[PDB]
Write a protein that binds this ligand. Structure first.
Ligand SMILES: Cc1cc(C)cc(Oc2cccc(-c3c(C)nnn3C3CCN(CCN(C)C)CC3)n2)c1
Ligand code: NA
Length: 126
């Protein structure tokens, strides 16, 4: 069985639009989403279909770009750091579960390189 996905809606949660969060959607997410290696990361890991009964025994804070995209589009976040953390959780989970040189790790590394290049130009909050 898969767990429920991370939440993307929560009326109780304080949230904002900031220029940094707008950059995270329009520049960061858009750049990674269109990449040829984005597809494994565009939705929660389906441990049933991938036949990974241990995945959610090991990965206790799952995250994926489909969730991040919905969070950004639904203005779920309060600040850029919350969203940056989600991207880092996604990459770290892949490295925790998999092994160096696996195809999925090479894919995550390519996306992470672009992520770092784009967040290096995150605008000053204004
Ligand atoms: C066999 C295959 C290879 C590749 C590149 C992608 C694959 O499909 C997907 C689809 C959605 C997510 C993921 C995924 C994420 C995110 N992180 N880990 N994963 C998998 C974890 C299991 N691995 C099993 C193969 N190892 C044991 C070598 C494969 C990677 N993978 C399947
Ligand atoms: Na948040």
């Amino acid at each position: 069985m898969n767990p429920p996905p991370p939440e993307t809606s929560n009326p109780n949660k304080p949230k904002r639009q900031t220029n940094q969060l707008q950059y995270l959607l329009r520049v960061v997410l858009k750049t990674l989403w269109k990449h040829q290696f984005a597809w494994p990361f565009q939705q929660p890991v389906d441990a049933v279909k991938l036949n990974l009964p241990d995945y959610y025994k090991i990965i206790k804070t799952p995250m994926d770009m489909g969730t991040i995209k919905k969070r950004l589009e639904n203005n779920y976040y309060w600040n850029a750091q919350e969203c940056i953390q989600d991207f880092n959780t996604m990459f770290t989970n892949c490295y925790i579960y998999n092994k160096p040189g696996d195809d999925i790790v090479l894919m995550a590394e390519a996306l992470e390189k672009l992520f770092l290049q784009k967040i290096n130009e995150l605008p000053t909050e204004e």
